[PDB]
Amino acid sequence: DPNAEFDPDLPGGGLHRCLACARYFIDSTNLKTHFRSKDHKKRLKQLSVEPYSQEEAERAAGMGSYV
Ligand SMILES: [Zn+2]
């Protein structure tokens, strides 16, 4: 199909998926918000899907900026 790097049937063009869920998300933000389930990534660690997942190898726990 002319001009379509994405798929028009799949949410998010089928380009944003959680492989562990086989679900297609409309946007990467929606997809990444989906991994905010700690138990999921826990299962991922057990299954060996992705060792060191989000909130661990990508954490919002820092920011050491003083004047
Ligand atoms: Zn998932």
From Swiss-Prot:
Its main location: nucleus. A zinc finger (C2H2-type) spans 16-40. One of its GO terms (cellular component) is cytoplasm. Keywords: Cytoplasm, DNA-binding, Metal-binding, Nucleus, Ribosome biogenesis, Transcription, Transcription regulation, Zinc, Zinc-finger. One of its GO terms (biological process) is ribosome biogenesis. Ubiquitous. Detected in spleen, prostate, testis, small intestine, colon and to a minor level in thymus and peripheral blood leukocytes. It comes from the Eukaryota. GO terms for molecular function: DNA binding; preribosome binding; zinc ion binding. It is found in: Nucleus, Nucleolus; Cytoplasm. The keyword Nucleotidyltransferase does not apply. Associates with pre-60S ribosomal particles. Involved in pre-60S ribosomal particles maturation by promoting the nuclear export of the 60S ribosome. Negatively modulates the DNA binding activity of Oct-2 and therefore its transcriptional regulatory activity. The protein is largely disordered, with the exception of the zinc finger domain. Belongs to the ZNF593/BUD20 C2H2-type zinc-finger protein family. This is Zinc finger protein 593. It comes from Homo sapiens (Human). The gene is ZNF593.
